[PDB]
Amino acid sequence: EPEWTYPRLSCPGSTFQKALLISPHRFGETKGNSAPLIIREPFIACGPNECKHFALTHYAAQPGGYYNGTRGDRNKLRHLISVKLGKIPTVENSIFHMAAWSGSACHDGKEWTYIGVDGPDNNALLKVKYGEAYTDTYHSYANKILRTQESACNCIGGNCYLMITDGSASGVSECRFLKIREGRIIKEIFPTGRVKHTEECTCGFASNKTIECACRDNSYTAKRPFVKLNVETDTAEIRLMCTDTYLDTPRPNDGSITGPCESNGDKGSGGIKGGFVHQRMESKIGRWYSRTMSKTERMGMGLYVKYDGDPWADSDALAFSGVMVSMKEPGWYSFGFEIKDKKCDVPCIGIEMVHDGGKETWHSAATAIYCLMGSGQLLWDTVTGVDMAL
Amino acid sequence: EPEWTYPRLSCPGSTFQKALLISPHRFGETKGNSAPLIIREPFIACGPNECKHFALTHYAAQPGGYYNGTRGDRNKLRHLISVKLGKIPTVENSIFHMAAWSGSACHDGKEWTYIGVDGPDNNALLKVKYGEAYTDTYHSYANKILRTQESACNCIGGNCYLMITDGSASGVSECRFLKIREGRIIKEIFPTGRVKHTEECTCGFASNKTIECACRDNSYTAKRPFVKLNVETDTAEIRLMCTDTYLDTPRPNDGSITGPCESNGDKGSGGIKGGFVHQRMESKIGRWYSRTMSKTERMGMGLYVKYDGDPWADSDALAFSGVMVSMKEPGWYSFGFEIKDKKCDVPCIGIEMVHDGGKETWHSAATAIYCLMGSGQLLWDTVTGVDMAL
Amino acid sequence: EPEWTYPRLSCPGSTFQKALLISPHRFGETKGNSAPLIIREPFIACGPNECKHFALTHYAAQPGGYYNGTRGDRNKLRHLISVKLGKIPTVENSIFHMAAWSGSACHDGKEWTYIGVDGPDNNALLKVKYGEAYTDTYHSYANKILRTQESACNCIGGNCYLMITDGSASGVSECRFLKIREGRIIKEIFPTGRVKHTEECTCGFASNKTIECACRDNSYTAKRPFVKLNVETDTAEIRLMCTDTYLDTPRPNDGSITGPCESNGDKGSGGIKGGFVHQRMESKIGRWYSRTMSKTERMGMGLYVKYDGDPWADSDALAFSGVMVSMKEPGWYSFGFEIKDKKCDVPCIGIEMVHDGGKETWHSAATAIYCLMGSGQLLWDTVTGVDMAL
Amino acid sequence: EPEWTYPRLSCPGSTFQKALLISPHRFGETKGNSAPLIIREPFIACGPNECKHFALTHYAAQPGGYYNGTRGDRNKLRHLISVKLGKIPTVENSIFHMAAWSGSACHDGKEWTYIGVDGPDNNALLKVKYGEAYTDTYHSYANKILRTQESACNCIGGNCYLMITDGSASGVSECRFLKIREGRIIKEIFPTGRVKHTEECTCGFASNKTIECACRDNSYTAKRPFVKLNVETDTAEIRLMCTDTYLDTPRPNDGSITGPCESNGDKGSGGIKGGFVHQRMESKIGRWYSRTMSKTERMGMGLYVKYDGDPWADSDALAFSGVMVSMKEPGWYSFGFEIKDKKCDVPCIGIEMVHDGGKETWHSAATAIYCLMGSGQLLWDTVTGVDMAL
Ligand SMILES: *[C@@H]1O[C@H](CO)[C@@H](O[C@@H]2O[C@H](CO)[C@@H](O[C@@H]3O[C@H](CO[C@H]4O[C@H](CO)[C@@H](O)[C@H](O)[C@@H]4O)[C@@H](O)[C@H](O[C@H]4O[C@H](CO)[C@@H](O)[C@H](O)[C@@H]4O)[C@@H]3O)[C@H](O)[C@H]2NC(C)=O)[C@H](O)[C@H]1NC(C)=O
Ligand SMILES: *[C@@H]1O[C@H](CO)[C@@H](O[C@@H]2O[C@H](CO)[C@@H](O[C@@H]3O[C@H](CO[C@H]4O[C@H](CO)[C@@H](O)[C@H](O)[C@@H]4O)[C@@H](O)[C@H](O[C@H]4O[C@H](CO)[C@@H](O)[C@H](O)[C@@H]4O)[C@@H]3O)[C@H](O)[C@H]2NC(C)=O)[C@H](O)[C@H]1NC(C)=O
Ligand SMILES: *C1O[C@H](CO)[C@@H](O[C@@H]2O[C@H](CO)[C@@H](O[C@@H]3O[C@H](CO)[C@@H](O)[C@H](O)[C@@H]3O)[C@H](O)[C@H]2NC(C)=O)[C@H](O)[C@H]1NC(C)=O
Ligand SMILES: *C1O[C@H](CO)[C@@H](O[C@@H]2O[C@H](CO)[C@@H](O[C@@H]3O[C@H](CO)[C@@H](O)[C@H](O)[C@@H]3O)[C@H](O)[C@H]2NC(C)=O)[C@H](O)[C@H]1NC(C)=O
Ligand SMILES: CCC(CC)O[C@@H]1C=C(C(=O)O)C[C@H](N)[C@H]1NC(C)=O
Ligand SMILES: CCC(CC)O[C@@H]1C=C(C(=O)O)C[C@H](N)[C@H]1NC(C)=O
Ligand SMILES: CCC(CC)O[C@@H]1C=C(C(=O)O)C[C@H](N)[C@H]1NC(C)=O
Ligand SMILES: CCC(CC)O[C@@H]1C=C(C(=O)O)C[C@H](N)[C@H]1NC(C)=O
Ligand SMILES: *[C@@H]1O[C@H](CO)[C@@H](O)[C@H](O)[C@H]1NC(C)=O
Ligand SMILES: *[C@@H]1O[C@H](CO)[C@@H](O)[C@H](O)[C@H]1NC(C)=O
Ligand SMILES: *[C@H]1O[C@H](CO)[C@@H](O)[C@H](O)[C@H]1NC(C)=O
Ligand SMILES: *[C@H]1O[C@H](CO)[C@@H](O)[C@H](O)[C@H]1NC(C)=O
Ligand SMILES: [Ca+2]
Ligand SMILES: [Ca+2]
Ligand SMILES: [Ca+2]
Ligand SMILES: [Ca+2]
């Protein structure tokens, strides 16, 4: 019989390495006979036995004749799909969980919870599934596009925690946290602090008592807002990441934002979902982050790390760990997830690599995975190997 | 070991919402590489661990060369098929249960029961299959196209109840109920009351004591015949629904059929199978129905609910719960099924959205899913997104 | 924990009915995107939990460019493949058990045994697999094409019995029986009686003590040789089926072979594998057989039945049960198999329907299934629905 | 719960026979609708319930547009993949374990261990994965293409032994052995003796005490270096095989290398990985090897055996056990693996049959399987049946 699940100490290791590429569109050419789903916003969640690869499909394959509109975001056809990690997400392999143009998922130890937001922009609806059953919803509270993590949610003792948000992308977007248990919302958590704009949060456990998320401010700053959730007291505070190594895109030169830690600075309009995962140690806490190689475009992806301290107060640059994606390749969304080993947890970062040929062709993505493994320096970058002309 | 299942209290919730679209022909294009089966009359039936998506195929794929005939109903090629709900029903994903040009299925908590009618129009044969084995048959009794539900049948305590009917579709078709147990028919129940013409009943549990069916008079009325089946005494009775919200298609204007409740009215000729599903609470029962948005065409699909009362006597209009399919998309057969959550049941409605381009091109169908979830109003509607020309 | 398996009493029923068609080539057209394996000699075997559909593929799909040679029999590419019954045997769905141009399989209650013969004609080799492991072989003893049942073998108390044979197709072919236990040959059984030519035997249990097979004489008679295996004493006798209803193809007019029961008669050169399954009752034994509608070509397929008596001595015509395949459709190999219901066994007959366009096109087959179900007369025939020009 | 596995006595048997052909490119034609992966360096590794078929893909299918590069070895796209043995390794059937341009895997009785080396030629990285989790890494030690077995590694009592090597392939490559446990490297074993150049060892258990490896000197000899690894003391020693039946390709004429056993000889430059597998009896051990039928080209594959004796000292020619691939078909890499039967182990040899049409067309491979089964001589040989022009 299955127990609830808890964050365990991390596995030993001092560096990340290239783990695995999932590039479906290597098989999307017209010469071929394969049918990979057009997707975006991939993310991964692992339970005690499998890891699932999730995405939002446009309900189209390549090749096909429904490309037109695949470079949009919300519509009545977007679905949350998954396959077992390491399987190519195709028409036959994928499972379609629910209609949703925004999503999340997480395993509590007994069951999968699936999260999908759909509906009209002025009144969207967060839906929840526990296994195969629809169990609860949540309503827009700002009437300006309710949306969620695009990342794994996080469960502890059967309590699953989920960031949601609502409000103008180019203005105020106050996020809330949901406390979900066996598919049903049992508490809403309103953060305090710097709440102006928080979205597309990437959250993991820093401890058995705290969740941390690095988030996106699409409006005011290239600093990432940084949430701290206290799971023992069901309360949350958000302050900007003080680090000179600004993690959003677009962004100014590192350390060029003058003033106190909460200062917004410039080139802070727009943003990108960023990767963040915890290395939990006995007397240490490892914080691993990812950001675009370009300060302006979605190209390349870098790995950064900082042990200990307070991300709210420390202005120190993050340590640069290595190049995961070269600047000559697309570097879009990235996310954190952990694989459950037998006795310990393995932290990993995934990378969405979008094939963008403009609005006059199909628009989709591959997923690069990096994971904490062994000692040394990160050794090799990743390429999609896709030529969109085929 | 497993035990027999019984209807449970429904899960908490106040409105339906868009769950899931299964739209195989989104990958049905010449430009592509997939092979979705040409099907019609879909329905869903869920068990303690799996929900299954059934349909009647024509034993052809799109694209393919065997379109001719796919706009017909009965032939030697038709087979009851299924995929796990959420999977695209393609040549490879599908499983072929039996030859059938009319079907049903249901889980008793121990095993799947599958039901398929095939054979000549003047001597059809209902076949029962329990798991992998074929176990019993029922004979035509009117020699006018013996036929069954096209929706999930209903199992309580190992006993599965099923509507069957036989007769001219422009005249009399007195239906019967079969009591099946572990694949074998143990009692025929002959309903009393308004028996002139019943078919394509959508049935579900109103309690541990009563099964209710909303049906189709293809001959005499636009009101749906409404079966109450007492499961304790194995007796059944039919009267027409009194509600001014007439549920068949075609139909006249709401509340325009004058006279006592049993009055047939104008626009009786013709019909369509309608969604019906139960919401079982503490000491009240909600009844959820679906009808096409057009009075005469198979376009659109609206949701309606009515808590309590006797459906044989309540002239009251049903409450309009929302638009599931717009008047600009096809709305064909609809059906009710329930999903099993950990401790309670989730009431759902499925809509068949047929792609119809005439007898000179392929003729298949998508399936839209709406389920009780959360509170509020029903928000978004469903399109199939299919271009029948691609 | 699993027990060994034994023949149980049959399920009640007095007639066969059309159960299920598996016609992969409905999806083989060039307009399509599917890839069904080119196969022949299909057969089915069921264990306590699933039923597997077996065949010998030419290691080619349709469409493709390896048709040339698919109208042959033995080569270094022929394999024994299977899928779960009701699944279309395609390149992806099928599993490849072993190289073999002749085969058999059966479940003992704990495990699958697979049988495949390959090698050169003058020295072929019978191979055995127990689950995934190759466990034993058997050698040609006549150097003239060692070959086997093309049908399910039969297990009792963990002992699986298998017909094999060797020798000229147009001359003498003395069959032997193998006693196999957990993948290894533990006894060879040499029949006595009329041993001149016995091949492609279709065997089932007539009792907990006897196996009966109806076989093919390709050389001397259109009567089917009829084996009786005694499982309590590991001994076997073969005599010709005395019945006027000659079951082989080609064949003379019924009852036209004058003389004693063992008389060969004419039109007895050549032959066809014929279907045969037992209806085991308390005080009765049902023997169900199938034979071509044509007396000369492989067209149509008929169902016959006789209760009780001695098939060695009785000259009475078999009772005609109905037309399974019309004479306007191909009727090639047929076979018997039983599905295990919960408390009882269900007898069924399968029919190989070859698409034969000559040697200048592909050459493959679909499988029609009929099964004992309910009372009355067999109601409907089967068609492949395939146009080989597509 | 499961327990650790140990080598068991082999099953009874005296000769190998043709088991199974996996030839994906039989469905690789333009005329068709399949998508087999372009792979090379296959190998098999079996566990207590499943046997897995591994390969290194180039992340492309046939037909497809990414042929260019598929005749190379190392690039960022290469991934270790697998299907259950008997399944066609296509885009949909496959699972992508990790990025790797050199690989291995093995089961300890509790879990799969997967091994993949990727990275720059001058700083490769071996990655260890235990089930779903990445668990450890090993670094280049010569900065000359760290690389591993390309065959199953070897687990006894939870300890998995693996050969790795690093060095110029036209010079020195002193190999090492890694002792892995539950994904983690717990000891490096540095072999003594003839260490000049070892690589691509094919390893297997000779007893509960000793692992034996037949390897490849790509530089100095056509004799195979032969590792004896004592598993009790974790020490290893290498000397060359003395047998006149030299096993590398290219090679000179048998018994033409004159001198003591350690003598290198002519035609040392170049090499190929060879099949090697153990047959463990009461108190004797058979050693089965494979070598290409041509002295200089990668054509054909023959089987050889030698019961007992010391392979470091036995000048005796090995007994020729048969032709598996004719001199008219490709014979590339070969490898040994064992299948687990109920109470004993089944020794097997796998052959890589590469389809080579030059650097201007696709470059992939089939896999032939031979296993110990029954007695006699080895009968039939294997073709792949592929036309590289289709
Ligand atoms: C239609 O009819 C069926 C059959 O009667 C009803 O199903 C039963 O529903 C009741 C609840 O109404 C169930 O009783 C409960 O069982 C709980 C344990 O879960 C399992 O229990 C056994 C094994 O322990 C299993 O065999 C079974 O399948 C259950 O899944 C108990 O924990 C509960 O007891 C607690 O609750 C109350 C106080 O709140 C008290 O009884 C106790 O003091 C205790 O605190 C509870 O008794 C019963 O198990 C169900 N049986 C079956 C076969 O399903 C349907 O509810 C009914 N539908 C209606 C009425 O709409
Ligand atoms: C390499 O090393 C391993 C570990 O020592 C050996 O594996 C053992 O092999 C022996 C046989 O040589 C096994 O002993 C036998 O166990 C049988 C039962 O099967 C299971 O037993 C237990 C549970 O009962 C399980 O834990 C285990 O995994 C087995 O699968 C017994 O029935 C046998 O006993 C009978 O046989 C003889 C007489 O013939 C007597 O011992 C008894 O009187 C009795 O009649 C038998 O003892 C042992 O279980 C194996 N262990 C493991 C962990 O696998 C390998 O054989 C060895 N390889 C070599 C030597 O080549
Ligand atoms: C916070 O989450 C739980 C809080 O209890 C921690 O998990 C638990 O960890 C303990 C020990 O780490 C486990 O207890 C036992 O440990 C002994 C060794 O002393 C061992 O022999 C037993 O077999 C047993 O495992 C306990 O089972 C485990 N529970 C679960 C559900 O995992 C967790 O480590 C904490 N997270 C941290 C510290 O980051
Ligand atoms: C020949 O095969 C076996 C020979 O024993 C028969 O199967 C066995 O049948 C008996 C009864 O049919 C089963 O015993 C028990 O029956 C009682 C009822 O009296 C029931 O309450 C028990 O639960 C139990 O089932 C026995 O279990 C069963 N064994 C197996 C392995 O199936 C079989 O019926 C014979 N075949 C014939 C007669 O055709
Ligand atoms: C809706 C606001 C938000 C910020 C602009 O848009 C996101 C940015 C997009 C992006 O930056 O690539 C992709 C996301 N799919 C989108 N989210 C939704 C719900 O549409
Ligand atoms: C045969 C009577 C019945 C009522 C008109 O026909 C149904 C009409 C249906 C319809 O109105 O679309 C299609 C159904 N598939 C068909 N059922 C059968 C068994 O043919
Ligand atoms: C080899 C003798 C036998 C009788 C002519 O041939 C069978 C007849 C063929 C047939 O009658 O259709 C098909 C069988 N695949 C074949 N068996 C083998 C092993 O090739
Ligand atoms: C790099 C040294 C080694 C020996 C020549 O190369 C091998 C030659 C092999 C060969 O001879 O065909 C192909 C192997 N895939 C390759 N291995 C790697 C890691 O590239
Ligand atoms: C459809 O089939 C009928 C016969 O069944 C045939 O007469 C008709 O021409 C076919 N239609 C087309 C468009 O080919
Ligand atoms: C293969 O790729 C190289 C560059 O990587 C390119 O120069 C060459 O032309 C390509 N070959 C073909 C046949 O296109
Ligand atoms: C698709 O783009 C076309 C241009 O090809 C444009 O006319 C239209 O806005 C879009 N239509 C749909 C259905 O997406
Ligand atoms: C296939 O048939 C061709 C004719 O197209 C003939 O030349 C030859 O005998 C056959 N070849 C193979 C490889 O089967
Ligand atoms: Ca920003
Ligand atoms: Ca009507
Ligand atoms: Ca004959
Ligand atoms: Ca050499």
Author numbering:
A (entry chain B), B (entry chain A), C (entry chain B), D (entry chain A): 76 to 465
Wording from the paper:
The NA active site includes catalytic residues (R118, D151, R152, R224, E276, R292, R371, and Y406; N2 numbering) that interact directly with the sialic acid substrate and framework residues (E119, R156, W178, S179, D/N198, I222, E227, H274, E277, N294, and E425; N2 numbering) that stabilize the active site. I221 (B NA numbering), I222 (N2 numbering), and I223 (N1 numbering) amino acids are highly conserved framework residues in NAs of influenza viruses.
We used X-ray crystallography to understand the structural basis of resistance to oseltamivir conferred by NA carrying the I221L substitution. The structure of the NA-I221L-oseltamivir complex showed that the L side chain protrudes into the hydrophobic pocket of the active site that accommodates the pentyloxy substituent of oseltamivir, thus causing a change in the conformation of the inhibitor such that its C81 carbon moves about 2.2 Å from the wild-type NA bound position.
